[PDB]
Amino acid sequence: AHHWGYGKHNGPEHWHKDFPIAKGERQSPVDIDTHTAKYDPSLKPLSVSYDQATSLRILNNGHAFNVEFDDSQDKAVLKGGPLDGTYRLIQFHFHWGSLDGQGSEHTVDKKKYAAELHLIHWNTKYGDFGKAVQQPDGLAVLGIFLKVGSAKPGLQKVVDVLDSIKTKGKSADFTNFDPRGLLPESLDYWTYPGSLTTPPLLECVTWIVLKEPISVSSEQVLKFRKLNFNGEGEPEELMVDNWRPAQPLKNRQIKASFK
Numbered sequence: 001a002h003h004w005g006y007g008k009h010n011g012p013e014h015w016h017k018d019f020p021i022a023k024g025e026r027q028s029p030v031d032i033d034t035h036t037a038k039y040d041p042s043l044k045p046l047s048v049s050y051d052q053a054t055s056l057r058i059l060n061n062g063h064a065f066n067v068e069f070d071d072s073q074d075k076a077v078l079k080g081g082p083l084d085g086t087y088r089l090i091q092f093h094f095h096w097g098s099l100d101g102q103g104s105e106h107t108v109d110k111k112k113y114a115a116e117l118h119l120i121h122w123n124t125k126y127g128d129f130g131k132a133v134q135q136p137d138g139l140a141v142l143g144i145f146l147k148v149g150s151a152k153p154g155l156q157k158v159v160d161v162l163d164s165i166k167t168k169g170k171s172a173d174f175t176n177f178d179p180r181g182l183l184p185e186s187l188d189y190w191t192y193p194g195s196l197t198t199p200p201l202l203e204c205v206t207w208i209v210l211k212e213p214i215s216v217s218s219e220q221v222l223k224f225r226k227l228n229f230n231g232e233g234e235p236e237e238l239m240v241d242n243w244r245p246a247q248p249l250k251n252r253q254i255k256a257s258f259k
């Protein structure tokens with residue numbers, strides 16, 4: 001069974017032994033070299049349509065916490081940008097560090113942010129998530145950087161529930177959460193073809209990384225760092241540094257939506 005993690009003996013540098021695609025040609029995350037990324041005037045504005053989003057539950061899965069949505073209909077979708085067709089929101093989660101100087105997966109000119117939010121969407125032309133992840137255009141992941149400054153009001157409902165899902169396998173009801181409260185003002189973005197950043201590391205993602213970070217408070221991110229990787233009753237391992245480092249860009253071009 002799965003046995004990978006972010007510990008001293010099972011972290012990202014080990015994943016290739018069970019998931020050989022870890023050394024593939026389209027792995028994520030990557031460093032975004034802002035000078036080399038080319039403005040692509042053919043890219044469209046992103047269309048984020050979350051007005052009818054229906055959150056259901058929040059789960060500590062032992063590597064992050066996932067806020068899960070009802071994806072049985074087109075209730076919350078991502079379209080436009082670099083995308084063809086319609087991608088349905090299934091979940092969001094974060095990656096974060098032990099200290100504010102690390103935590104993001106993508107980097108910008110080698111800068112690491114304190115955390116990174118991933119909003120996961122699957123291409124409805126493949127019918128279900130499990131089929132979508134087997135396709136090169138199966139997923140669209142909206143990535144948003146977090147920096148530490150002022151509080152993010154729309155994040156507070158998430159932080160306040162974390163005490164109830166401290167350990168792996170715990171979940172809680174999490175209805176009526178509005179993910180629009182996690183977006184920055186601008187939807188300017190970079191995009192490139194990549195992969196899931198945790199096993200199975202499948203090469204099925206169109207990455208859309210927003211340029212503008214959101215600000216969260218130190219107190220908010222400190223609450224992320226009180227979560228545990230371990231299950232109830234087991235030796236406490238704080239859930240921190242659950243990020244994969246940048247991977248080789250290889251042939252790929254990162255495109256910018258903005259001049």
Ligand SMILES: NS(=O)(=O)c1nc2ccccc2s1
Binds near residue numbers: 003009
């Ligand atoms: N990261 S992994 O290749 O999946 C991995 N799995 C295991 C299992 C036991 C001990 C160390 C590792 S490291």
Ligand SMILES: NS(=O)(=O)c1nc2ccccc2s1
Binds near residue numbers: 198201
């Ligand atoms: N961290 S991520 O690339 O957004 C992501 N990875 C995985 C792995 C398995 C299932 C869903 C996702 S979503």
Ligand SMILES: [Zn+2]
Binds near residue numbers: 094095197
């Ligand atoms: Zn992620």
